[PDB]
Write a protein that binds this ligand. Structure first.
Ligand SMILES: Cc1cc2nc3c(=O)[nH]c(=O)nc-3n(C[C@H](O)[C@H](O)[C@H](O)COP(=O)(O)OP(=O)(O)OC[C@H]3O[C@@H](n4cnc5c(N)ncnc54)[C@H](O)[C@@H]3O)c2cc1C
Ligand SMILES: CN(C)c1ccc(O)c2c1C[C@H]1C[C@H]3[C@H](N(C)C)C(O)=C(C(N)=O)C(=O)[C@@]3(O)C(O)=C1C2=O
Ligand SMILES: CN(C)c1ccc(O)c2c1C[C@H]1C[C@H]3[C@H](N(C)C)C(O)=C(C(N)=O)C(=O)[C@@]3(O)C(O)=C1C2=O
Length: 368
C-alpha cells in the first residue's frame, strides 16, 4: 500500500469525488473529502445523471453500490418532437434494457455515495482557495476555516477548478454553444401541455439552431435545457432578470408551439451557462513538487452532449483507486502517472465524441 502511513485529500464531493473517496476508503486508505457545500442537504442544481455499463456502473459495482443505484434510478423512454409538437419518434425502455442507463437524481446519487462512507469522511463548508507544497505534505487553505495537510491531493472539484496550476497550465475554453437550464415544479399543473407531450418520456426537439431537452420526472420536477450557438451580440441577457431571459427565449422560440412557450412563461428562474471544455490537449506537468492529480470535470470537463461527463469521471476514480491500492507501482507518483496516461486516452475519446455531437447538433439540418 503506497498510502500506508499517509492521507489523501479529495477536493470536492461531487459524484466523482465521493466515488473516489469510497474506492479508497474500502482499501483502508485514510481519505477526507473537502466540500464547498454548506451541508449534505444543499440542493444540487441540474438534471439527472445516467450511469453506463462498462464505465459508471463498473465504478458503482466496485463500490458495492450498483443495486442501490438501480433502486433509486428510473429508466426513461425518449420522445423526439418537432417545434410544432408532433411526436416524430417514441423510444420506450424495453424490459431487457431497463438497467442499461436509468436516470438518477443528483441528490439521490450524492446520498447513496455519502451513506457508503465512514462518518466524517466528508468535511462540509470547506472551500479550497489555495494549495501549497511543503516538504512532505501539501498545505490546504480553506476559506475562513482551519488549514489541513495531506500527502496526496486529488482535485475533484469540477470543471471551473481554480487550483489546477500545480498539475497543468491548460485553461478552460468556451466551445461556442450556450445552455439555459431550469426546473418547473408540479409540471402536470404548471406546464400541462408540455408535460403531456413528454408523456413520462424524456423529450428532445430541434429547430433552426435551437435545441430543447427535457426530463419531465426528476423526483417530480421537470428539468429542461435550451441550447444554441452563442449569439454574436454576446451578456445582452441578464440571468438574474427573468424578464430579459423570457424576452430572449420567446423571440428565439416565436416559431414553436404554444406548449413550449408555456414552458418558458411558467419558469421562475433560469441558469445560463456557456458550454466549456478543459481540453486534454497537451500533457500535464511532469515535474510536480508533491503528489497531486485531477479526476472528473476538473481533469477533462467536456460539453454535455454525449452523456460521457459523469461516466468518464467515474472511470477515473476506478482507475486511480485501483492504482493507489496495489503495490503494483513503486511510488504514488507512478501510480498517478499511469492513471493519467490511461485517462488521456479515453478522456480524449469522450471529449471528441462530445465536441463532434455538439457540432453535429448545431448544423442547419440536424435530425436526432
Ligand atoms: C448543464 C449541464 C448538464 C450536464 N448533463 C450531464 C449529463 O446528462 N450526464 C453526464 O454524465 N454529465 C453531464 N454533465 C456533467 C456532469 O454533471 C458532471 O460531469 C458530473 O457532475 C461529475 O462531475 P464532478 O464530480 O467531476 O464535478 P462536479 O459535479 O462539478 O462536482 C465538483 C464538486 O466540487 C465542489 N467544489 C467546487 N469548488 C470547490 C472548492 N473550491 N472546494 C471544495 N469543493 C469544491 C462542488 O461543490 C461540487 O460538489 C452536465 C453538465 C452541465 C454543465
Ligand atoms: C438473474 N437473476 C435472477 C436476476 C433476475 C432479474 C433481475 O432483474 C436481476 C437478477 C440478478 C441481480 C444481480 C444483482 C446483484 N447483487 C445481488 C446486488 C449484482 O450485484 C448485479 C451485478 N450486475 O453485479 C446486479 O445486476 C443486481 O444488482 C441486479 O440488478 C440483478 C437483477 O436486476
Ligand atoms: C442528443 N444528444 C446528441 C445526446 C446524445 C447522447 C446523450 O447521452 C445525451 C444527448 C443529449 C444531452 C441533452 C443534455 C441537455 N443539456 C445539454 C444539459 C439537457 O438539458 C438535458 C435535460 N434532460 O434537461 C439532458 O437530457 C442532457 O443533460 C443529456 O443527458 C443529454 C444526453 O444524455
Amino acid at each position: 500500500n503506497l498510502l500506508s502511513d499517509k492521507n489523501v485529500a479529495i477536493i470536492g464531493g461531487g459524484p466523482v469525488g465521493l466515488t473516489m473517496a469510497k474506492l479508497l476508503q474500502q482499501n483502508g486508505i485514510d481519505v477526507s473529502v473537502y466540500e464547498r457545500d454548506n451541508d449534505r442537504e444543499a440542493r444540487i442544481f441540474g438534471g439527472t445523471l445516467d450511469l453506463h455499463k462498462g464505465s459508471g456502473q463498473e465504478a458503482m459495482k466496485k463500490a458495492g453500490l450498483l443495486q442501490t443505484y438501480y433502486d433509486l434510478a428510473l429508466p426513461m423512454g425518449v420522445n423526439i418532437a418537432d417545434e410544432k409538437g408532433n411526436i416524430l419518434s417514441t423510444k420506450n425502455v424495453k424490459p431487457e434494457n431497463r438497467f442499461d442507463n436509468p436516470e438518477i437524481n443528483r441528490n439521490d446519487l450524492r446520498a447513496i455515495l455519502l451513506n457508503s462512507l465512514e462518518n466524517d469522511t466528508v468535511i462540509w463548508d470547506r472551500k479550497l482557495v489555495m494549495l501549497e507544497p511543503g516538504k512532505k505534505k501539501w498545505t490546504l487553505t480553506f476559506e475562513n476555516k482551519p488549514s489541513e495537510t495531506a500527502d496526496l491531493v486529488i482535485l475533484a472539484n469540477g470543471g471551473m477548478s481554480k487550483v489546477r496550476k500545480f498539475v497543468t497550465d491548460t485553461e478552460v475554453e468556451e466551445t461556442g454553444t450556450f445552455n439555459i437550464q431550469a426546473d418547473i415544479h408540479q409540471p402536470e399543473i404548471n406546464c400541462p401541455g408540455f408535460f403531456q407531450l413528454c408523456n413520462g418520456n424524456r423529450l428532445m426537439a430541434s429547430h433552426q439552431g435551437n435545441l430543447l431537452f427535457a426530463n419531465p420526472n426528476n423526483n417530480g420536477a421537470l428539468h429542461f435545457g435550451i441550447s444554441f450557438k452563442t449569439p454574436d451580440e454576446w451578456t445582452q441577457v441578464d440571468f438574474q432578470n427573468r424578464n430579459s431571459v423570457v424576452d430572449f427565449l420567446l423571440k428565439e422560440f416565436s416559431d414553436w408551439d404554444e406548449r413550449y412557450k408555456e414552458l418558458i412563461h411558467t419558469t421562475l428562474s433560469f441558469v445560463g451557462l456557456a458550454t466549456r471544455i478543459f481540453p486534454l490537449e497537451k500533457p500535464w506537468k511532469s515535474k510536480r513538487p508533491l503528489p497531486i492529480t485531477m479526476i472528473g470535470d476538473a481533469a477533462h470537463l467536456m460539453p454535455p452532449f454525449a452523456g460521457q461527463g459523469v461516466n468518464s469521471g467515474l472511470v477515473d476514480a476506478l482507475i486511480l483507486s485501483d492504482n493507489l491500492a496495489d503495490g503494483k507501482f513503486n511510488s504514488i507518483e507512478e501510480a498517478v502517472k499511469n492513471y493519467e496516461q490511461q485517462m488521456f486516452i479515453y478522456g480524449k475519446e469522450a471529449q471528441e465524441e462530445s465536441t463532434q455531437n455538439e457540432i453535429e447538433m448545431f448544423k442547419p439540418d440536424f435530425t436526432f
